[PDB]
Amino acid sequence: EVQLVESGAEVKKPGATVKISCKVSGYTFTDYYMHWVQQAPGKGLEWMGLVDPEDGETIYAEKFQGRVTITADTSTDTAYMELSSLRSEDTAVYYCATSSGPSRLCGGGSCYHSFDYWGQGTLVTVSSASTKGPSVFPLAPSSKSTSGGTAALGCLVKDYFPEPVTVSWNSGALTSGVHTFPAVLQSSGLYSLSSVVTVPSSSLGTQTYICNVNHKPSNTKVDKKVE
Amino acid sequence: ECDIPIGAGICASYQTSQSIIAYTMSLGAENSVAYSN
Amino acid sequence: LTQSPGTLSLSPGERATLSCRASQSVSSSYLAWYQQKPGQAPRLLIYGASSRATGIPDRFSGSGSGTDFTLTISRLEPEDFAVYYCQQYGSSPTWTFGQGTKVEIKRTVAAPSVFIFPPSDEQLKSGTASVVCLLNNFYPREAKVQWKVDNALQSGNSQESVTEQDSKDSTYSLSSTLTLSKADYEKHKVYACEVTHQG
């Protein structure tokens, strides 16, 4: 019913400035506050500020004031947030949200402000790095690969930037026992991750294993064989 | 132990998320005294 | 805001209570509560310190007084396994959120199966090493991991151990990676990993 529709994700150097957007649909935009909320990966929610689209008045958390600024446009049905003097700590989600129901349409009547509807949460990534494709290396347990050891074969995917890496196994035909561990940002400024096939070479589908890795930003493709 | 008395052996208290509970009051811990001749 | 316990991990089907607490910086009606699954936008559960939003199950219940407030979940479901946030109005200027209590509700109890991986020919010919130790099929995420050669290498500034992944196997999993020079694979005659779990 109510729709908040943000910008796509952004990638920046420290010291830069970025602008984020949030289109409104399904409701009369003029009547509502629009709010902006941060979330760093695995941390809590954090309110940054709000705008009244009916005249452009605005309020901020004093923690983000002067770095952040917020603006609105009733011709494009859209709110916008600018974050300036960026840092690595700004590597986070930035949602738009109503805390607003002039009528709490499809949700209630009274609003109590209370953060009723949310946009999809635009990512901003801040690093000293620049666009680069992954290395991929094979993994088999113990000193050389072994018969029982076929049960845990994998890859390490190393030093790519920005996101996303995408991974599949045996040209996308193997999904039984496939597993992936969370990606981590290395001290290099670039991401890394690992993945495994948790099943031994007892079948024609497991006699050999392939880490098929594709990094979208580079257009890099790799079909790494594990033995 | 009886906290707030309701009557007919019922008492009530604020206790464990804490809520008002209502219970038959306990007169004391039981004790079988170790008597022999 | 204070929110407690920092994770709430009781069995499904029970009654379980989250708490949200504050200084006198905030006002008594304007508490609210939210659900977030991994990577999702938050969903408004409770407002008015006690009212459910429309389309939220009657088994959720908010209550409180002064600056001590609560959300009781009842008849718990696996769909509740998420981070849960309270929030409250800072009387007039500002919006303040709670900790994000992870509803890590009881799945299984298990110690880790473990696999250990030395460096490999492509990695070494690329001028690098990274030793890998993998843990899976465990609950809770009570895990501790240590690297050895075969004495100790856990002091290495290049060691890493990523956050845990939950699974359809009703259990957590995790990985440690010990990135190194190829000259460390030339130096050390053996590599090993040791694990502590359930306490």
Curated annotation (Swiss-Prot), chain B:
Residues with glycosylation annotation: T16, N37
Disulfide bridge positions per record: C2-C11
Uses, biotech or industry: Main component of the anti-COVID vaccine Chadox1/AZD1222/AstraZeneca; in which the human tPA leader sequence is added in N-terminus to enhance protein secretion.
Subcellular location: Virion membrane; Host endoplasmic reticulum-Golgi intermediate compartment membrane; Host cell membrane
Highest taxon above the source species: Viruses
Mod. after translation: The cytoplasmic Cys-rich domain is palmitoylated. Palmitoylated spike proteins drive the formation of localized ordered cholesterol and sphingo-lipid-rich lipid nanodomains in the early Golgi, where viral budding occurs. Specific enzymatic cleavages in vivo yield mature proteins. The precursor is processed into S1 and S2 by host furin or unknown proteases to yield the mature S1 and S2 proteins. Processing between S2 and S2' occurs either by host CTSL in endosomes, or by host TMPRSS2 at the cell surface. Both cleavages are necessary for the protein to be fusion competent. Cell surface activation allows the virus to enter the cell despite inhibition of the endosomal pathway by hydroxychloroquine. The polybasic furin cleavage site is absent in SARS-CoV S.
UniProt similarity note: Belongs to the betacoronaviruses spike protein family.
Miscellaneous section: Variant D614G has become the most prevalent circulating sequence in the global pandemic since April 2020. The mutation is associated with higher viral loads produced in cell culture and animal models. It would not change pathogenicity nor neutralization properties vs vaccination. May be prevalent because the mutation increases virus transmission in human population.
Note on domains (UniProt): Contains sequence and structural motifs very similar to those of a bacterial superantigen and can directly bind and activate T-cell receptors. Activation of a broad T-cell repertoire may be involved in the hyperinflammatory syndrome in acute COVID disease. The KxHxx motif seems to function as an ER retrieval and binds COPI in vitro.
Protein name per the record: Spike glycoprotein
Organism: Severe acute respiratory syndrome coronavirus 2
Residues included from the entire protein: 661 to 709 of 1273
